[PDB]
């Protein structure tokens, strides 16, 4: 019946998502409505900046992407997926898209600012999380993938760099640049080397199960302080991943090792998340026995770690990046390519 209650929530959620999926919001703001303060991160085609909405005084995080660069690297479809998916989803552990627009030069997405910083920063500094602390975060991702996959979405870039910590210590998943709505298999070689499932590396055509593999990698990295497969160059990482050989730190609880053995299963018919029982194989595993899944969804559970921040606009949980002036050309670049954005 708990299982039925989740089944009901998902059907409702799917109806909401499809309305926005089929009729996406367009052009709901303008650049000169925002004051640009500081860069919080970068990516291949641009950056995310803290901004202040001038008429409300609210702070947001604005992704700016350069259209020409996107087109040069043939990443049009993926950037169009990012915005289309992000505007349609609604979940407590997904970052909220507030506005989007474009001009002659750039694409813009204005999201909720998540001031606690990236999980990556905290994990590197502290070293590793204790199993209860990792479990807390893992549970939020389990539910988030349960949500996303019911919508036929695959996320494909789970890593601590894309998990922001909010003021209450919960996760907000960001950076949907490889998210894709797909009913069957797909083939793009994409993602972050350390987190790539074997079937992606092997050019096999793959599905949602790549997200469950990636969750395995994440939980390991959270609890070990390093990922299961690492080396100085990508090619050596790929070799380790396809070999199907994982060593666990001596301090891992036997329940944690057993989970990871099922998530880091090279064999897709054996991988937790890809079985007839679906996500329930994961939620019912012994490592999660103390997890109250609904309390997590509702956010009544007490976060093991709450980031400090002196007020809105505070960026102290973020690294410093070099700033660059945003130039907007007088001539429209790549109009047809981005017409739906």
């Amino acid at each position: 019946s708990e299982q039925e209650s989740v089944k009901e929530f998902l059907a409702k959620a799917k109806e909401d998502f499809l309305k926005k999926w089929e009729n996406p919001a367009q052009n709901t703001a303008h650049l000169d409505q925002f004051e640009r303060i500081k860069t919080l991160g970068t990516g291949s085609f641009g950056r995310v900046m803290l901004v202040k909405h001038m008429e409300t005084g609210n702070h947001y995080a604005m992704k700016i992407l350069d259209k020409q660069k996107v087109v040069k690297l043939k990443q049009i479809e993926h950037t169009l997926n990012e915005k289309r998916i992000l505007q349609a989803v609604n979940f407590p552990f997904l970052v909220k898209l507030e506005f989007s627009f474009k001009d002659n030069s750039n694409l813009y997405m204005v999201m909720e600012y998540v001031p606690g910083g990236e999980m990556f920063s905290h994990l590197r500094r502290i070293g590793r999380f204790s199993e209860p602390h990792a479990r807390f975060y893992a549970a939020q991702i389990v539910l988030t993938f349960e949500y996303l996959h019911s919508l036929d979405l695959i996320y494909r870039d789970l890593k601590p760099e894309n998990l922001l910590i909010d003021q209450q210590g919960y996760i907000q998943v960001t950076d949907f640049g490889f998210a894709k709505r797909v009913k069957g298999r797909t083939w793009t070689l994409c993602g972050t080397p350390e987190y790539l499932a074997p079937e992606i590396i092997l050019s096999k055509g793959y599905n949602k199960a790549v997200d469950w593999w990636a969750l395995g990698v994440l939980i390991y990295e959270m609890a070990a302080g390093y990922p299961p497969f690492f080396a100085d160059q990508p090619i050596q990482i790929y070799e380790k991943i396809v070999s199907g050989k994982v060593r666990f730190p001596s301090h891992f609880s036997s329940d944690l090792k057993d989970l990871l053995r099922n998530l880091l299963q090279v064999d897709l018919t054996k991988r937790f998340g890809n079985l007839k029982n679906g996500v329930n194989d994961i939620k019912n595993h012994k490592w999660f026995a103390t997890t109250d899944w609904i309390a997590i969804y509702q956010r009544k559970v007490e976060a093991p770690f709450i980031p400090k921040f002196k007020g809105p606009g505070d960026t102290s949980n973020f690294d410093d990046y070099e700033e660059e002036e945003i130039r907007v050309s007088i001539n429209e670049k790549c109009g047809k390519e981005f017409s739906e954005f």
Binding site: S44, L73, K74, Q75, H78, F120, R124, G127, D157, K159, E161, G177, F178, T188, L189, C190, G191, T192, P193, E194, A224, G225, Y226, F230, A231, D232, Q233, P234, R247, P249
Partner: peptide, 20 residues
Amino acid sequence: TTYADFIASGRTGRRNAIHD
């Protein structure tokens, strides 16, 4: 230790995605 090998590795910073 594996921790020490990770820390001396070239991949302890932010990791970029690859694409097609």
